[PDB]
Design a protein around this nucleic acid. Structure first.
Ligand SMILES: [Mg+2]
Ligand SMILES: [Mg+2]
Ligand SMILES: [Mg+2]
Ligand SMILES: [Mg+2]
Ligand SMILES: [Mg+2]
Ligand SMILES: [Mg+2]
Ligand SMILES: [Mg+2]
Ligand SMILES: [Mg+2]
Ligand SMILES: [Mg+2]
Ligand SMILES: [Mg+2]
Ligand SMILES: [Mg+2]
Ligand SMILES: [Mg+2]
Ligand SMILES: [Mg+2]
Ligand SMILES: [Mg+2]
Ligand SMILES: [Mg+2]
Ligand SMILES: [Mg+2]
Ligand SMILES: [Mg+2]
Ligand SMILES: [Mg+2]
Ligand SMILES: [Mg+2]
Lengths: 60, 126, 175, 49, 52
RNA sequence: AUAUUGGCGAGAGACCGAUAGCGAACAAGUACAGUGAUGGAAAGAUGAAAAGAACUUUGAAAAGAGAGUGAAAAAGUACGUGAAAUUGUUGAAAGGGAAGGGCAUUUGAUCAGACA
RNA sequence: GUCGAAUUUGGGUAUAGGGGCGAAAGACUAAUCGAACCAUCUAGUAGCUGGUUCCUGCCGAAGUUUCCCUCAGGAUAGCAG
RNA sequence: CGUGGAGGUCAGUGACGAAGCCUAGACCGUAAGGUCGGGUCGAACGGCCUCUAGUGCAGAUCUUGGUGGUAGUAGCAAAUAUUCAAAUGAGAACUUUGAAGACUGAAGUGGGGAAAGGUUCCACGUCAACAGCAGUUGGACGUGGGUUAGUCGAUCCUAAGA
């Protein structure tokens, strides 16, 4: 019913839903046979990896 | 099968010794095998892990990643690699606890004692 | 998570709960049953009137040796009370459920209490010293409360050959 | 500091449910009291009034 | 162990005490005080016909 | 050559598996009781990894609702599984001073086999 | 009731269990006194009460005889295999 | 018929889900019981031939633990007695100040000590539990501060006695 898409006591857990999806993939295979912090750190690593004369010979 | 009367096959005794092993014994318990290149170069198969050597992860969800050993947490029977971590939204980084039997040493940290250990294990360094 | 009952289409519902609340389980059950099924705003105004002692909470199950009052005639009973502590806890949960519905975007004028459930929390076990050097129990009965509010929204017959023949004959005989 | 505070607050819950005065309240009650369960009342002196 | 279930100071409270006549631990100030003892049907008692 | 429920060091079992096994698997001869001699418990299990719920919102706060971590929160430091007694809610049914049981069938609900 | 003494009371000290102490009540000796409390021998002694855990099939009793003087506790005969 | 453990075997079952538990579903046994489906669960378990035993519960005023009805009931009625405004606070019958009314009535509900207790004294912070209502308050919880001797005692002397 959720794939197709009051008060009830009938609920489906995530653990059971994941097992159902896994077993459906198994059956389908048989039927066919027959992070912002990471991005910031990466950018930082990628970005880090005459002349002039003032004054003169005197004591001001 | 065992033959010596001084060795025990008792599961309870073996597990007790493992979990109560002191730090000097845990050093030997936390041994990591060498890479194929280092095995050919030196002639030995495994060494105790230490702080400043490079490793490759060959098992688990972090397989294929490399880095330097950040620390050897002997208290929790684990090693920590600087490159291998877990990140949160708030900027938190938590080190991944890795077991050295699931790693491969790619570059040894060489000192006088390490060279002597390789030589007495039967190595041919340089 | 793990409510006693959940709503189908959770995009039209909001939930609230409170656990290990130091309030009487029996009085709280009576208050929740008085609220069960009402519109949210009407329920809140009714609880305000109960605090003001203008209306009463009918006591139906846990009611042995209770006084009688004229304010129970609205609900067709004689035994009703005004449990202020239970009303305050339920009012807090109602306000929280309204806030959650508002955050979800539901219409506040169409919300009704579609589920409310009170069960017993683990007991708070004080003891009292009594005559002849006895120790007797002296316990609090706390409550777990939960509620869900909801937006209100507005054959082949097999016959025998005899039956088929009768129907066909009636059809031929009639128009 | 806040993590340690939360750990202590979670740890306190069973003792608080048992209504102890604190971590120092370790009163123990006997299973049965002999002075309450040691009675055969003859025609004479009793253990209580 | 031949001492298992026997390292207890306990005695019966007698007939007519409105409780069963199994021996009970004396003393006070601990939850053990007043509990049944020595019996094969008692928690912490001696097993029937202990293995030799 | 013989003895050895103490001490020290070892190896084992058709033994017990947290109401069992030593009283004690855990800061156990502890906590607690008694003037004292002495008496004497209860108490093991999140997760592979604390990654132990950041952040928004309601609330004085505990907390709740979104969100997130995680294979799983039908693992949230009340934490593996999670029985019964007893309880709440929902749906169905019965009820003129007990209920329960047996034989038989009606009614309502529900369901398997057999379909060449 | 008694209330200036055979008075009331604190502290120290002495007397210890088949013992003490007693203006004598088997009173009191740490809520314990016709025998204090604690540990052990010790799982002490049973003429007696209570309880004693799965199924089915087949067979299936016994108060009636003589005795240890008679009660008590035992023997024997019969009945079922 | 059933249970724990043991030797042998089924190259037995199992992360495409072991054991356990729940079940308005299905089947086989006269029965003890056995088998299958669904849900939950998350790592081990069974058939057969034999061995072995701490092997089957409704009762024992049984043992330990847990839970009901009683029941929001009995009751929280000794010690004459409390009221107003402000402040604080989310919240004040119960906290603080002020305003009132009372009481102990010097053989005190005052001021000090002995035995005993051991920090309860005082300050700051502060309400999960406790104070049989409440609580912002506390002899509670958290962190600290505080006990100054030639002259006050012990110490010395001896009493009954040891
Ligand atoms: Mg009444
Ligand atoms: Mg008393
Ligand atoms: Mg035992
Ligand atoms: Mg034990
Ligand atoms: Mg659980
Ligand atoms: Mg049940
Ligand atoms: Mg006495
Ligand atoms: Mg399974
Ligand atoms: Mg047995
Ligand atoms: Mg039973
Ligand atoms: Mg029976
Ligand atoms: Mg009973
Ligand atoms: Mg009343
Ligand atoms: Mg009064
Ligand atoms: Mg007066
Ligand atoms: Mg006066
Ligand atoms: Mg109170
Ligand atoms: Mg003070
Ligand atoms: Mg303090």
């Amino acid at each position: 019913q959720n794939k197709k898409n009051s008060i009830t006591t009938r609920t489906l857990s995530k653990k059971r839903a994941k097992k159902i999806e896994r077993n459906l993939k198994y059956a389908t295979q048989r039927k066919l046979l027959v992070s912002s912090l990471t991005l910031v750190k990466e950018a930082l690593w990628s970005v880090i990896d005459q002349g002039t004369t003032l004054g003169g010979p005197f004591f001001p | 099968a065992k033959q010596s009367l001084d060795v025990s096959s008792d599961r309870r005794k073996a597990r007790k010794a493992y979990f109560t092993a002191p730090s000097s014994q845990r050093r030997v318990l936390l041994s990591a095998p060498l890479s194929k290149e280092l095995r050919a170069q030196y002639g030995i198969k495994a060494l105790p892990i230490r702080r400043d050597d490079e490793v490759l992860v060959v098992r688990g969800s972090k397989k294929g990643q490399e880095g330097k050993i950040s620390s050897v947490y002997r208290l929790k029977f684990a090693v920590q690699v600087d490159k291998v971590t877990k990140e949160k939204v708030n900027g938190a980084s938590v080190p991944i606890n890795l077991h050295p039997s699931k790693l491969v040493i790619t570059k040894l940290h060489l000192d006088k004692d390490r060279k002597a250990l390789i030589q007495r294990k039967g190595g041919k360094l340089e | 998570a793990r409510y006693g009952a959940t709503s189908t289409n959770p995009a039209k519902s909001a939930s609230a709960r409170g656990s290990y609340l130091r309030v009487s389980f029996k009085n709280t059950r009576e208050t929740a049953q008085a609220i069960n099924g009402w519109e949210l705003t009407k329920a809140q105004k009714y609880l305000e009137q109960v605090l003001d002692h203008q209306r009463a909470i009918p006591f139906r199950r846990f009611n042995s040796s209770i006084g009688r009052t004229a304010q129970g005639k609205e609900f067709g009973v004689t035994k009703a009370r005004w449990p202020a502590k239970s009303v305050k806890f339920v009012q807090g949960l109602l306000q929280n459920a309204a806030a959650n519905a508002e955050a979800k975007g539901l219409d506040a004028t169409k919300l009704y209490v579609s589920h409310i459930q009170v069960n017993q929390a683990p007991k708070q076990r004080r003891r009292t010293y009594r005559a002849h050097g006895r120790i007797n129990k002296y316990e609090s009965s706390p409550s777990h409360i939960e509620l869900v509010v909801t937006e209100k929204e507005e054959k082949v017959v097999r016959l025998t050959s005899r039956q088929r023949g009768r129907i066909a004959a009636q059809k031929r005989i009639a128009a | 500091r806040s993590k340690a505070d939360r750990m202590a607050k979670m740890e306190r819950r069973e003792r608080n449910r048992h209504a102890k005065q604190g971590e120092s309240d370790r009163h123990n009650a006997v299973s049965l009291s002999k002075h309450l369960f040691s009675g055969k009342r003859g025609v004479g002196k009793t253990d209580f009034r | 162990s031949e001492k298992a279930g026997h390292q207890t100071s306990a005695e019966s409270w007698g007939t007519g005490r409105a409780v069963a006549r199994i021996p009970r631990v004396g003393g006070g100030g601990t939850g053990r005080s007043g509990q049944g003892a020595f019996g094969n049907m008692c928690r912490g008692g001696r097993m029937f016909a202990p293995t030799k």
